[PDB]
Amino acid sequence: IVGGQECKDGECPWQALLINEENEGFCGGTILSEFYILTAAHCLYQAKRFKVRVGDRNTEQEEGGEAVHEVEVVIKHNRFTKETYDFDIAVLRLKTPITFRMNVAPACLPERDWAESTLMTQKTGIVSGFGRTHEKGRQSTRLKMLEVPYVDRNSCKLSSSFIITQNMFCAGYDTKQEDACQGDSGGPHVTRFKDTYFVTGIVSWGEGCARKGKYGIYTKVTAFLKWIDRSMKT
Amino acid sequence: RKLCSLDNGDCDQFCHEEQNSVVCSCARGYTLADNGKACIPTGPYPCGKQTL
Ligand SMILES: CC(C)N1CCC(NC(=O)c2cc3ccccc3n2CC(=O)Nc2ccc(Cl)cc2)CC1
Numbered sequence: 504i505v506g507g508q509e510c511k512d513g514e515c516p517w518q519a520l521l522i523n524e525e526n527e528g529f530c531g532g533t534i535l536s537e538f539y540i541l542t543a544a545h546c547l548y549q550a551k552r553f554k555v556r557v558g559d560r561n562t563e564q565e566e567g568g569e570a571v572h573e574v575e576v577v578i579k580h581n582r583f584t585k586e587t588y589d590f591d592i593a594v595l596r597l598k599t600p601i602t603f604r605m606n607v608a609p610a611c612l613p614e615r616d617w618a619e620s621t622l623m624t625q626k627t628g629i630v631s632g633f634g635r636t637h638e639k640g641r642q643s644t645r646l647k648m649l650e651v652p653y654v655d656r657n658s659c660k661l662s663s664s665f666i667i668t669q670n671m672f673c674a675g676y677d678t679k680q681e682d683a684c685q686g687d688s689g690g691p692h693v694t695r696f697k698d699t700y701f702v703t704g705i706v707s708w709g710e711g712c713a714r715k716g717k718y719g720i721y722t723k724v725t726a727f728l729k730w731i732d733r734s735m736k737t
Numbered sequence: 738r739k740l741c742s743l744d745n746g747d748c749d750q751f752c753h754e755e756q757n758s759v760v761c762s763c764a765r766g767y768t769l770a771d772n773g774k775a776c777i778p779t780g781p782y783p784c785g786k787q788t789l
């Protein structure tokens with residue numbers, strides 16, 4: 504997260520952290536239910552074996568509300584491709600359920616049609632993670648959140664040197680040095696509506712971080728809702 | 738702006754137009770309130786809420 508503010512006690516309970524064998528956070532996650540985590544498809548290649556930590560805001564000082572969970576099942580969208588990063592989405596089934604508490608709560612899943620004409624038509628969404636605070640910088644030890652505006656679909660594509668498929672959408676700023684970054688991938692992108700937060704995107708990728716004329720690219724969650732329910736059902 | 742196009746059909750959450758009439762519904766963990774508009778959390782820690 505380049506810029507933004509740190510998630511204050513309670514502000515980002517649906518955040519989830521994917522850690523490797525060395526307890527180093529390498530990707531983000533979104534709590535969907537006591538058993539299911541949502542994350543970027545490409546994050547699965549970042550480490551051979553990983554667990555999921557929840558209820559953490561400071562990676563170096565136990566807030567006593569943290570909790571590690573072993574991943575039991577990994578459901579990667581079969582159409583994912585490291586070539587264009589299309590279908591960058593995957594669900595995780597946890598061996599043990601999540602015990603909701605102060606900084607551990609699920610983010611709601613909306614209905615496609617409503618989400619598209621109301622949530623995605625809002626002015627801004629929220630993105631958060633333990634990612635880098637600068638492009639060449641290092642991982643953050645403090646959980647962060649950034650308010651990123653929705654970027655017009657046209658401008659979006661015109662600014663991307665890479666292709667922007669129908670499963671992605673731009674967000675962030677044209678020049679303002681605020682944007683998600685490495686480590687935030689697979690992280691949450693939620694839109695707020697009447698004091699209720701709805702999942703609306705997965706942190707996917709981007710050309711650099713906060714680079715002028717470049718936006719942040721998120722997986723269009725409303726395009727995999729039917730797929731996300733099937734995966735959870737079984 | 739008509740129906741759901743107008744202030745979300747006054748729904749707390751999901752709003753869908755069915756026969757020139759509004760119809761509200763809530764995400765898993767909520768139940769439609771009496772007014773068929775608001776959404777009441779079913780148990781503790783309902784989805785989409787900051788534990789502030
Ligand atoms: C196949 C093609 C599409 N390709 C996919 C991978 C993508 N690379 C990155 O993505 C990327 C790698 C990387 C490593 C260190 C620092 C930043 C990095 N970014 C940038 C980064 O991670 N930035 C960033 C910003 C906003 C959001 Cl939402 C998510 C990520 C480059 C394009």
Ligand SMILES: [Ca+2]
Pocket residue numbers: 559560561562563564565566567569
């Ligand atoms: Ca901690």
